Amino acid sequence: DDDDKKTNWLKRIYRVRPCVKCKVAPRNWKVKNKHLRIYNMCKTCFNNSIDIGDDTYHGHVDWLMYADS
Amino acid sequence: DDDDKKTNWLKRIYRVRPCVKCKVAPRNWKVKNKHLRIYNMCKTCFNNSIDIGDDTYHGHVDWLMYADS
Ligand SMILES: Nc1ncnc2c1ncn2[C@@H]1O[C@H](COP(=O)(O)OP(=O)(O)O)[C@@H](O)[C@H]1O
Ligand SMILES: Nc1ncnc2c1ncn2[C@@H]1O[C@H](COP(=O)(O)OP(=O)(O)O)[C@@H](O)[C@H]1O
Ligand SMILES: [Cl-]
Ligand SMILES: [Zn+2]
Ligand SMILES: [Zn+2]
């Protein structure tokens, strides 16, 4: 089943690349209708980046959650 | 740059999972407007599957080619 290839990929994509900033925590994310938005940082490091004034790691990658578009 | 995280992922996704049927050739694919469609089989095994009457591996996974949806 093709939807499961996509789901297992997202599961892996999410797991093997932690927060770009602290490198250990997993990334923040949310579901935005038909896509999964994976933010570049965990929530702790994102808030911290505002405080310290660094917007270098700000960003996200959206992933279609289904196999067919 | 976020578009590049998506591109490098697709590059990897495409490379580490060859044809589901013969297991060596890389998969067929095409660009369908804003998505990359990765078919489950290379072209040789897909045509062959019609000939032998097996539709078990028929299918594809579409991937949004950009970071933002
Ligand atoms: N945890 C995070 N790590 C990195 N960047 C983030 C994080 N949370 C938000 N951002 C960035 O801040 C902005 C807010 O995004 P978001 O709230 O998803 O947009 P929208 O409100 O349109 O859904 C975007 O640039 C997003 O990439
Ligand atoms: N190389 C291949 N491997 C596996 N399945 C395939 C392959 N080529 C086509 N198919 C399947 O046959 C059908 C034809 O798909 P496609 O021509 O992409 O649709 P469309 O013409 O709407 O763009 C779909 O079920 C597709 O998944
Ligand atoms: Cl996707
Ligand atoms: Zn972090
Ligand atoms: Zn093959």
Sketch out chain B's domains with CATH numbers. Answer: 1-69 (3.10.450.210)
If one counts every other C-beta atom within 10 angstroms of the C-beta of residue A5, the result is: 18
- Structural tokens at position B42: 């290379």
* Rounded Cα gap, residues A9 and B17, in angstroms: 11
Resolution, Å (one decimal) = 2.5
Q: Whose CA is nearest to atom 21 of ligand 2?
A: B32
Cα–Cα distance, A30 to A41 (Å, whole number): 12
Experimental technique for the deposited model = X-ray
Ligand 2 shell residues, CB under 6 Å:
B 28, 32, 37, 39-41, 43, 46, 57-60
Q: In which order are the strands placed within the sheet that holds A29-32? A: A29-32, A35-39, A60-64
